Every structure is written in structure tokens, then in C-alpha cells.
Design a protein around this ligand. Structure first.
Ligand SMILES: CCCCCCCC/C=C/CCCCCCCC(=O)O[C@@H](COC(=O)CCCCCCCCCCCCCCC)COP(=O)([O-])OCC[N+](C)(C)C
Ligand SMILES: CCCCCCCC/C=C\CCCCCCCC(=O)O[C@@H](COC(=O)CCCCCCCCCCCCCCC)COP(=O)([O-])OCC[N+](C)(C)C
Ligand SMILES: CCCCCCCC/C=C\CCCCCCCC(=O)O[C@@H](COC(=O)CCCCCCCCCCCCCCC)COP(=O)([O-])OCC[N+](C)(C)C
Ligand SMILES: CCCCCCCC/C=C\CCCCCCCC(=O)O[C@@H](COC(=O)CCCCCCCCCCCCCCC)COP(=O)([O-])OCC[N+](C)(C)C
Ligand SMILES: CCCCCCCC/C=C\CCCCCCCC(=O)O[C@@H](COC(=O)CCCCCCCCCCCCCCC)COP(=O)([O-])OCC[N+](C)(C)C
Ligand SMILES: *[C@@H]1O[C@H](CO)[C@@H](O[C@@H]2O[C@H](CO)[C@@H](O[C@@H]3O[C@H](CO)[C@@H](O)[C@H](O[C@@H]4O[C@H](CO)[C@@H](O)[C@H](O)[C@@H]4O)[C@@H]3O)[C@H](O)[C@H]2NC(C)=O)[C@H](O)[C@H]1NC(C)=O
Ligand SMILES: *[C@@H]1O[C@H](CO)[C@@H](O[C@@H]2O[C@H](CO)[C@@H](O)[C@H](O)[C@H]2NC(C)=O)[C@H](O)[C@H]1NC(C)=O
Lengths: 32, 295, 152, 51, 51
């Protein structure tokens, strides 16, 4: 229970880290 | 993976790559699947198909997993492929659900061994006998083609599969993995009064009890006539079913299905994790192949 | 919630947030998911993805509930994520339906004890009688095939 | 329902499992040593098999 | 097995050969000859069925 709650909570912060930093509209066609 | 035979799990996956290749060929052979993806402005020779080989597996897997895809074919030759692969899909999922709803309501369990011959090949399940007893003396003396092989085991692993008494042999089957060999009238006494044990196999030797008399006694013939009189009236079946009756154990306790834990399913979590690790290797594989085209 | 263990209800929901975060990262890392949402007019540097974090949970929950969504990934690295999470989904629903079709038929096969013969087999439910009474004296004296077992 | 009635059924395994069947009928050699046993028997099932 | 019968070498009433055959049968039964004989004639054609 604990390791898998640790791995997902790592990936949950990284997904917010990609969502905020990526402009994702028309910028960086091949990046991240 | 139990509710479908391993013949069927291969025949689904062979048909999943099979119909995917047919639907790809039969869409290129058909003229009706060729049209324009630009309906806003008029034609400028922009007639274009939609079925790649990558999309055809995505229609094969995407319809097999009851989810659907974005292709949705529009030729009559391709819709008959989609119309049959859909009917192929329902009678797999509704046969997988119905058979898994038959395993979880009726437990029909089987022991690995059924005879001495089925125990003549097992090395995980080890034998046992009372040391210097009448049971061990039989296999030392025996010559019939299997019991010598059963003695080839027990003579090698002495003080390992040779027990000291009947009480230790019962307490070793009950705790460890063990296949203890003993008399047939004690097994019919233990099993009736210990409901979690069983008797596998049949009678190997054929002994017999008897009222002992002195050498040349007059009572031998009068008891022999008396035993045969009791044996036909049914008293020696009334006596044996009075003392070997035991506590009267249960043979029906189908419980509520004891909800699916990690022990029942959880190999699904293995193939879930194996799919995501494989996807990363394809991602870094296609990250470089696109740049190799750009280089 | 009975046909699946509370270990499993947590492990599905932990994998529902788990695969949703992986499919979001693995789509941004992949070049094939970047394209133009404007196919009518030609390119004017309008290369744009579709996977938000909000959409990736909507693909995670939307595929778990057997309904589907509007994303439908188109890179090979993302379709393997969708191809496994779909196979993860069938063997949960077809295990939930099959186990719930085992709870409802076991408590329908069962009958309460209705006689001495149905009580002649039970060991969970134990008998009773007034000691040295007229009721106990009957089973001590009886010989009819079941009451001896009830006296046993 | 078809696949679990197939699993709830058991084949006959004894005289007691044959003591309840009426679709499957018994048999014995008439005036033989086998029929003479069930005529003479008293043990709780074989009388029903002789009935 | 429902009943429990048994065969036997018949002798006249008060024959000397009863005790000498009884010792002889028990000698053959422990050496394994009466399992070699029964698995020679009740062996049959050796069926395949298992499946
Ligand atoms: C892209 C790739 C496609 C591949 C085709 C599909 C794959 C074909 C199938 C292959 C395997 C089945 C046949 C092999 C049998 C060998 C037995 C074995 O060792 O199994 C082992 C596990 O097995 C696994 O771990 C399987 C993991 C593979 C993940 C597949 C993901 C790809 C699907 C992509 C989806 C496509 C998406 C759409 C694409 C457009 C046994 O485990 P164990 O630890 O030994 O436990 C036993 C312990 N005990 C002995 C004590 C009891
Ligand atoms: C209902 C849903 C609809 C149907 C969906 C069908 C799809 C394919 C499904 C299954 C195809 C895989 C072949 C299975 C053959 C049986 C192997 C076996 O017995 O156990 C193996 C399990 O170890 C594994 O191999 C894990 C594989 C699980 C399925 C992974 C398929 C990838 C997803 C598919 C996505 C793309 C599809 C493919 C197209 C690219 C061996 O392990 P074991 O422990 O040593 O076994 C002994 C235990 N026993 C004695 C009791 C047996
Ligand atoms: C990018 C993804 C990386 C991972 C992030 C996950 C993303 C989020 C998805 C899922 C997260 C939440 C669910 C957890 C997933 C499975 C873990 C689990 O609980 O199963 C078992 C624990 O497993 C063990 O840790 C011990 C046994 C290891 C088996 C093989 C490990 C391979 C894992 C993958 C490595 C690569 C595989 C090969 C690659 C080609 C539970 O079993 P148990 O209760 O202990 O009792 C049975 C014990 N027995 C198993 C011995 C019989
Ligand atoms: C170590 C062992 C582990 C395994 C090793 C691998 C692990 C990783 C190690 C190394 C990475 C290797 C990964 C493979 C290549 C991925 C990259 C890619 O697909 O891009 C291209 C490669 O083009 C091709 O060469 C054809 C392969 C893709 C089409 C077939 C898909 C159907 C697969 C069925 C699945 C089941 C198969 C049957 C299963 C029984 C394809 O390009 P495109 O997008 O299609 O077209 C657009 C291109 N264009 C823009 C220029 C026009
Ligand atoms: C953004 C938000 C995401 C949320 C996800 C969270 C997932 C869930 C995680 C954890 C679930 C929480 C566990 C419950 C523990 C409380 C126990 C309890 O007291 O019972 C309470 C039950 O009432 C509820 O708790 C219902 C709440 C449903 C979950 C919230 C909706 C999920 C939205 C998903 C939307 C997808 C988003 C799609 C995105 C594109 C009240 O009980 P009672 O009546 O007061 O007491 C009577 C007691 N008696 C009956 C025994 C007599
Ligand atoms: C379901 O079926 C399983 C198959 O046999 C069975 O598994 C065995 O269970 C027994 C106990 O029930 C296990 O015995 C254990 O063995 C370990 C070995 O390290 C011991 O720590 C311990 O034995 C002890 O022995 C003492 C005497 O030396 C005794 O006094 C103690 O009380 C204690 O029993 C454990 O008992 C055995 O290993 C299992 N076999 C395996 C894993 O192969 C399950 O019990 C059975 N479950 C039910 C509910 O019936
Ligand atoms: C047969 O053996 C099993 C396994 O030992 C017994 O089942 C459980 O055994 C554990 C021992 O670890 C007890 O704590 C449980 O209470 C037992 N479950 C029950 C009683 O439901 C089982 O009781 C044994 N059968 C007998 C003794 O008749």
C-alpha cells in the first residue's frame, strides 16, 4: 500500500509539473 | 485466465492479428473507403484513406476490449468485417463472464495424486511409513514394478520419510506436505474423526484379521461358522458403522464466494505494470526514430 | 462493494490515478501526439497536443466505467497504455459481475434448518435437551436411524 | 446458468447416490447370490434398494 | 465393495490338506504371486481411455 502510494504521488506531482510549465498551445512541437 | 482454455486464449489473439490484417487489405481493395478528409473546401485531388496498419490493430484491439475506436468503417465490405468481429467479441466476453461466474460459485477441487502410480512420479510430495512396522516391511519385500521404486525413495531418505509412530505420521500430513502409508482400517478411523484429511488410492495389500486360537483348538470351526453367520445377517456392518462412524463430518459447505483479493486476481496488476514499462521503451524508441528522420 | 476486497478497491483507484499520470507524461514525451487541430487551412505553427491532466483523468475514469472518451490516442507509446488499461478494465468488471453472481446464488441456494434431518448434519448449530427429562430419555431409548445420531 | 448446473451436478458415486435416483434403474441376476443379499439385508438403504 | 465374500480351495469335511494349503496360500500371498496372477488374467487388453 505504502510504496504504491509513494510512486503515484511522485507521478502526480510530475504531471502537475508538466501541466504548469508546458505552454502546450502552439509552442514546443517536439519537447518534454 | 482459468475460465478460458489456453487453446482459446491463443485462438483469440491469433484471430485478433488475423482480422486486423484482413480489414486492412479489404479496405484498400475497396473503392468506397477512399474519400476526402477536407469536406469544407471542394476537391483538389485530396482523396485519402484512413486505415493504416497501426489503425487496424487499434480497431482490432479496440473492439475486442468493448471500448471502440475512431475509425468506424463506411464500406459494405469493411462493415461486414466489423459486423462479425463485434459478434465474435460478445460471445467471448459473455462466455468469460459466465464461466467465471461458474468457477466462483461451485468449487470442484482435486488432489494432485490418486494412486500409488500417480505418487510414483511425484518428488514434491514425499512418502512415509512407520519404521520397522508391517507397512515398511511390505515395500522392502515387494517386487512389483512400482513398490520397489517406492522403496527406492524411502531407503535413500531414511530418517526423513520414515516416521517413528502412527501419531507422528498423522501430525505430519496435517502440518507438512506428506503422503503417509498405513493400514486401511485406521485411515477409515482418522478421516471420520478428523474432517480435513482424506484417503486417496485403494487397497494395496490384502491382509485380514481373525480370532486367534491355539494350535489345534476345537473352537476354530465353531467360530468360523459363527463369524460367517454374523457376516451375512449384517452384524459386522452394524458394528463397523457404529465405531468407524465417527463424529459424522460435513460434506457441503459452499460458502459465499470469499471476495476476490490479491491472491485471486493480481496477476492483472503484473501485466498492468508490464504494459507501462513496455510503453516507455517504445516511447524512447520512437523519440529517437523521429529525430533520426530529422537528423 | 462486497464482491471485491477492500485491498482491490484501493488498488484499482491507485492505478486509476497511476495510469492517468503515466499517460499524461508519456504523451508529452512522445512526438507523434503533437499535430494540428486545424486541418482545413495549412500549417501556421499551430502544432498542438490534446492531453491535459484534466483529460487524462477523464480517459482514466472514462475507460474504467466502460463508456469511453473523446481523446482516443494516436501514438504507439500511448496506445499501448490504452491497450493495457482496457484489458485491465474488462477483468475487473467481468470479475465484479461474476463474483456478484456468486454471492446472490449462494444466499439463494441456502435454506434454513427445517427438520431434525436437516439438523442431523449441522455441527455449527448444536442440539440441546433437559438433562434427566422426558425429552432426553426419548433419544437415549430411540433407535430410528437419525435420533441415535442425534444422541451420538 | 447453463455452466453452473453443469458444475453443480455430480455423477453417481455410491449406492447412497443411487438410492435417490429414479431415472437410473437398478438391476440384479434373478435368483442369484446378488439378489439374495438385498432380500436378506436390513441396513437402511439396501432395503430401499430392494423396495 | 458392498458385501465382503471370499473364495477358497474347498476340501472334504475333516481333510488333512486344509492346513497345508492355508499355509501355502499365505506364502504365495506375501511373496506376491497372487498379485502376479491376478494382473496376468484381469490385465485385459490394456485400455486407453483416460482423456
Ligand atoms: C506491443 C506488444 C504486443 C504483444 C502481444 C500481446 C502479448 C502476448 C503474450 C505474451 C505472454 C503469454 C505467453 C507466454 C507464456 C510464458 C509463461 C510466463 O512466463 O508468464 C509469466 C508472466 O507473464 C507475463 O508477465 C506477461 C507480460 C507481457 C505483457 C504484455 C504487454 C503487451 C500488450 C500490448 C497491447 C497492444 C496495444 C495495441 C497496440 C497497437 C508467468 O509469471 P510468473 O512470475 O512465472 O508466476 C508463476 C509463479 N509460479 C510458477 C510459482 C506459479
Ligand atoms: C475476456 C477479455 C476478452 C479477451 C481478451 C484477450 C486478449 C489476450 C489475452 C491473453 C493472451 C495471453 C496468452 C494467455 C495464455 C494462457 C497462459 C497461462 O495459462 O497463464 C500464464 C500467465 O502469465 C502470462 O502470460 C500473463 C499474460 C496475461 C495476458 C496478457 C495479454 C496482454 C494484453 C492483451 C492486449 C492486446 C491483445 C493481443 C493483440 C496484440 C502463465 O503463467 P503461469 O502462472 O505459469 O500459468 C500456470 C497457471 N495455471 C496452471 C492455472 C494455468
Ligand atoms: C512504469 C511503471 C513502473 C511501476 C509503477 C506502477 C504504475 C501504477 C500501476 C500499479 C500500481 C499499484 C498496483 C501495484 C502493481 C503490482 C504490485 C503488486 O501489488 O503485486 C504483488 C506485489 O508485487 C511485489 O512487489 C512482490 C512480487 C514481485 C512480482 C513482479 C514485480 C514486477 C513489477 C513490475 C516491474 C517491471 C515488470 C517487467 C517489465 C518488462 C502483490 O502480491 P502479494 O500481495 O505480495 O502476494 C502474492 C506474492 N507473490 C506475488 C509472490 C505470489
Ligand atoms: C528488448 C526486447 C523488447 C522489445 C523491443 C522493443 C523495445 C524498445 C527498443 C527499441 C525500439 C523499437 C520499437 C519499434 C519501433 C517503434 C517506432 C515506430 O513505431 O515508428 C515508426 C517505425 O516504423 C516501422 O519501422 C514499422 C513499425 C511500426 C508499424 C507497425 C505497428 C503494428 C504493430 C502491431 C503490434 C503487435 C505486433 C505482433 C505481436 C505478435 C512507425 O511510423 P508511423 O507512426 O506508423 O507512420 C508515420 C511515419 N511518418 C510520419 C514518417 C510517415
Ligand atoms: C475532483 C474530485 C475527485 C474525487 C475522486 C475521489 C475518489 C473516491 C476516493 C475516496 C472515497 C471516500 C471514501 C468514503 C469514506 C467515508 C465513509 C462514510 O462515512 O460514508 C459516507 C458515504 O458518502 C461518501 O463518502 C460518498 C463520496 C463519494 C466520493 C466523491 C465523489 C467522487 C467523484 C469522482 C469524479 C471523477 C473526476 C473526473 C475528472 C475528469 C457517508 O456515510 P453516512 O450515511 O453519513 O453514515 C451511515 C453509516 N452506515 C450506512 C454504515 C449506517
Ligand atoms: C490450506 O491448505 C494448505 C495446504 O496444506 C495448508 O498449508 C499448510 O498449513 C500448515 C499449517 O496449517 C503449514 O504449517 C506451518 O509450517 C511452518 C514451517 O515453518 C511452521 O512454522 C508451522 O508448523 C508448526 O509446527 C509445530 C510442530 O512442529 C506446531 O506445534 C505448531 O502449532 C505449528 O503448526 C506452520 O503450522 C504448512 O507449511 C502449509 N503448507 C504449505 C505452505 O505448503 C493450509 O493450512 C490450509 N488452510 C486451511 C485454513 O485449512
Ligand atoms: C483442519 O485444518 C485446518 C487448518 O489448520 C483447520 O482450520 C483452521 O485452522 C486454524 C489453525 O491455524 C484455526 O485457527 C482456525 O480456527 C480453523 N478454522 C476453523 C475451525 O474454521 C480446521 O479446523 C481443521 N479441521 C478440523 C480440526 O476438524
Amino acid at each position: 500500500i505504502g510504496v504504491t502510494s509513494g510512486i503515484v504521488l511522485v507521478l502526480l506531482i510530475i504531471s502537475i509539473l508538466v501541466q504548469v510549465k508546458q505552454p502546450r498551445k502552439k509552442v514546443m512541437a517536439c519537447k518534454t | 485466465l482459468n475460465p478460458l482454455s489456453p487453446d482459446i486464449w491463443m485462438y483469440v489473439l491469433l484471430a485478433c492479428l488475423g482480422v486486423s490484417c484482413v480489414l486492412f487489405v479489404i479496405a484498400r481493395f475497396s473503392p468506397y473507403e477512399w474519400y476526402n478528409p477536407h469536406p469544407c473546401n471542394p476537391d483538389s485531388d485530396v482523396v485519402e484513406n484512413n486505415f493504416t496498419l497501426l489503425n487496424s490493430f487499434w480497431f482490432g484491439v479496440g473492439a475486442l476490449m468493448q471500448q471502440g475506436s475512431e475509425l468506424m468503417p463506411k464500406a459494405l465490405s469493411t462493415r461486414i468485417v466489423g459486423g462479425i468481429w463485434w459478434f465474435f467479441t460478445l460471445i467471448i466476453i459473455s462466455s468469460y463472464t459466465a464461466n467465471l461466474a461458474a468457477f466462483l460459485t461451485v468449487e470442484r477441487m482435486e488432489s494432485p495424486i490418486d494412486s500409488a502410480d500417480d505418487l510414483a512420479k511425484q518428488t514434491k510430495i514425499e512418502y512415509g511409513a512407520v519404521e520397522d512396522g508391517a507397512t515398511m516391511t511390505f515395500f522392502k519385500k515387494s517386487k512389483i514394478s512400482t513398490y520397489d521404486k517406492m522403496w527406492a525413495f524411502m531407503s535413500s531418505r531414511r530418517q526423513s520419510v520414515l516416521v517413528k509412530s502412527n501419531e507422528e505420521g498423522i501430525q505430519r500430513v496435517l502440518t507438512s506436505d506428506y503422503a503417509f502409508l498405513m493400514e486401511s482400517t485406521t485411515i477409515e478411523f482418522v478421516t471420520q474423526r478428523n474432517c480435513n484429511l482424506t484417503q486417496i488410492g485403494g487397497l494395496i495389500d490384502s491382509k485380514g484379521y481373525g480370532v486367534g486360537t491355539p494350535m489345534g483348538s476345537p473352537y476354530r470351526d465353531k467360530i468360523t461358522i459363527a463369524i460367517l453367520q454374523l457376516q451375512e445377517e449384517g452384524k459386522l456392518h452394524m458394528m463397523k458403522e457404529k465405531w468407524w462412524r465417527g463424529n459424522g463430518c460435513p460434506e457441503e459447505e459452499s460458502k459465499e464466494a470469499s471476495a476476490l483479493g490479491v491472491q485471486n486476481i493480481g496477476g492483472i496488476f503484473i501485466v498492468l505494470a508490464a504494459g507501462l514499462v513496455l510503453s516507455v521503451f517504445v516511447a524512447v524508441g520512437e523519440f529517437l526514430y523521429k529525430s533520426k528522420k530529422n537528423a
